[PDB]
Each structure stands twice: as C-alpha cells, then as structure tokens.
C-alpha cells in the first residue's frame, strides 16, 4: 500500500542548435501527471492527468517558476560538468535528475531521493540517510565536497520529508479513483501451430494498472522456463499496461501447461489453460 512521487528531468546540450533542451515529467506511482518542455510554446508546467487539473492558478504559476529555475540550473551544471571532465564544447551531453519520495500505507515519509546522472552514468546521489552523498567519479567528488560544505543535503530534507510527502498525500486523495484503485489484467490464451510437431501458447495480460505483474508457465504443475519468451511490460497508451508470456510445446501436450497471472488487482492469482 506504499506510493511514490517522482520528478524526472533530462537536459541535453546541442551545440549549434541553441541552448540545451530541458524536459521534466512528474509521476505518482505509474501515472504521469505533469510535464514541462523548454522547447514548447507554452513555457508552462502542463497537466497530464485529469486529477491535477483541480489545482488552482497559483499552483500552475508556482510549479512553472520552480521547473523553469531547475532548467536554468541544469544548463549551468552541464557547463560545469564539461569543465570538470575537460570535454570539448563541440559535443552534446546529457544531464538527468530524479528526485521525489516514497510513503507508506499511512501516508508518512519512507524514503527520499535526489540524484543525477551525466551522459548516462551516475554522477551524485543523496544517500538514504538524507545527510550524505555518493559520488561516482573524481568530478562528482568536487561537487560532493562543495555540497557537504554548503549543507545542501539538509536543504533538500525539508522538501523530501515535508513538501514532497504533503503533495503526494494530496494527489493520492484527489486522484484516488485511479491512483488508489487497480485495473486487473484482462487475460486470454492463444494457440499457434508452428510446425507439424510444435505449437506456441501465448498468455496475454492486457489493460492492467499498476504495471507490476508476474506471468509464469508451469508444466504438470512445476515451473517451466525452458522454451519460453516473456516480453517487457509495455504501455497500452491509455494509462494501462500489457505483457505476454509464450511457451513452445510439443503438439498434443498443450493440456500439461498452465499460465499463472499475479497482479495486485486480482484477489486470487489466475490459472489459464488452453
């Protein structure tokens, strides 16, 4: 019954094509609810889920100011990183940030995050105690020493333990009809003869929320992983998710095989047979 709020930002320099592009998105659990895109005409934080549209004009003004300020900060951080790594101004580089919080079933603070990656590799991350940093290479240690000196970690703690948790609590109530509900998977099995001697059984899970799911095969009631294929969970595009699991079986033995579906929206796991 835990929940999470995350903000994800991507800054990409593009020498010769203007200032770096900045895109930030916000999520509660597996639901996106806001975006900001430096290249868009709006220049506003924008809603991306119905239940955030309830927030008033002051919210959109304030959130817009905060995300714009972050965009300008990470533009400077891209410039600084180039200097720390002694890299040419001719190249394009990426600075990603993630921050946010986890809360338990009681809505109280569980964990906070505040972390960066440069060119796809960890740069610096706030540790779980919210007072120390993990610095990944000799450049990030310069930043770590500066941030230790300036008590940057303490400055983030009020947000991560307070404002972040408070916001997530409000969103969970305002959006409860999706965020505190589940869509169980719609399931079915298909059969594909692939040769005179083999057939493929494919077990489908469609339209489920949240994204966490487990699909497994058994043969005669024992786990079957040989000759299986399991696709990565993928978005349907409507807020829900899809997954399938397939197994190649000897023609005539289909009835020995069962597909097992575990999901939060299912009171009891499902067992499917051809």
């Amino acid at each position: 019954g835990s929940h999470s709020m995350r903000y994800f930002s991507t800054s990409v320099s593009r020498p010769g094509r203007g200032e770096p592009r900045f895109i930030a998105v916000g999520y509660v659990d597996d639901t996106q609810f806001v975006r900001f895109d430096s290249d868009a005409a709006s220049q506003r934080m924008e809603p991306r889920a119905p239940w955030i549209e309830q927030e008033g004009p002051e919210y959109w003004d304030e959130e817009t100011g905060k995300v714009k300020a972050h965009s300008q900060t990470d533009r400077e951080n891209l410039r600084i990183a180039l200097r720390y790594y002694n890299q040419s101004e001719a190249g394009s580089h990426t600075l990603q940030m993630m921050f946010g919080c986890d809360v338990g079933s009681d809505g109280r603070f569980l964990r906070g995050y505040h972390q960066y990656a440069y060119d796809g590799k960890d740069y610096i991350a706030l540790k779980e105690d919210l007072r120390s940093w993990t610095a990944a290479d000799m450049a990030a240690q310069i930043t770590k020493r500066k941030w230790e000196a300036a008590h940057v970690a303490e400055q983030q703690r009020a947000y991560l333990e307070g404002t972040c948790v408070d916001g997530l609590r409000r969103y969970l109530e305002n959006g409860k009809e999706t965020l505190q509900r589940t869509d169980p998977p719609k399931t079915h099995m298909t059969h594909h003869p692939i040769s005179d001697h083999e057939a493929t059984l494919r077990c489908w899970a469609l339209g489920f929320y949240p994204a966490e799911i487990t699909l497994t095969w058994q043969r005669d009631g024992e786990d079957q992983t040989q000759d299986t294929e399991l696709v990565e969970t993928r978005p349907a595009g409507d807020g829900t998710f899809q997954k399938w699991a397939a197994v190649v079986v000897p023609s005539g033995e289909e009835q020995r095989y069962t597909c097992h579906v575990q999901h939060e929206g299912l009171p009891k796991p499902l067992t499917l047979r051809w």
Binding site: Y7, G26, M45, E63, G65, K66, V67, A69, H70, T73, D74, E76, N77, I80, A81, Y84, M97, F99, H114, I142, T143, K146, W147, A150, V152, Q155, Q156, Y159, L160, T163, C164, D166, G167
Partner: peptide
C-alpha cells in the same frame, strides 16, 4: 509539488 533546484555543481 516540485522542489526548486538552484544548487550548482
């Protein structure tokens, strides 16, 4: 709710 990010590297 966003956190204003103003700290440089």
């Amino acid at each position: 709710q966003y956190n204003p990010i103003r700290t440089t590297f």
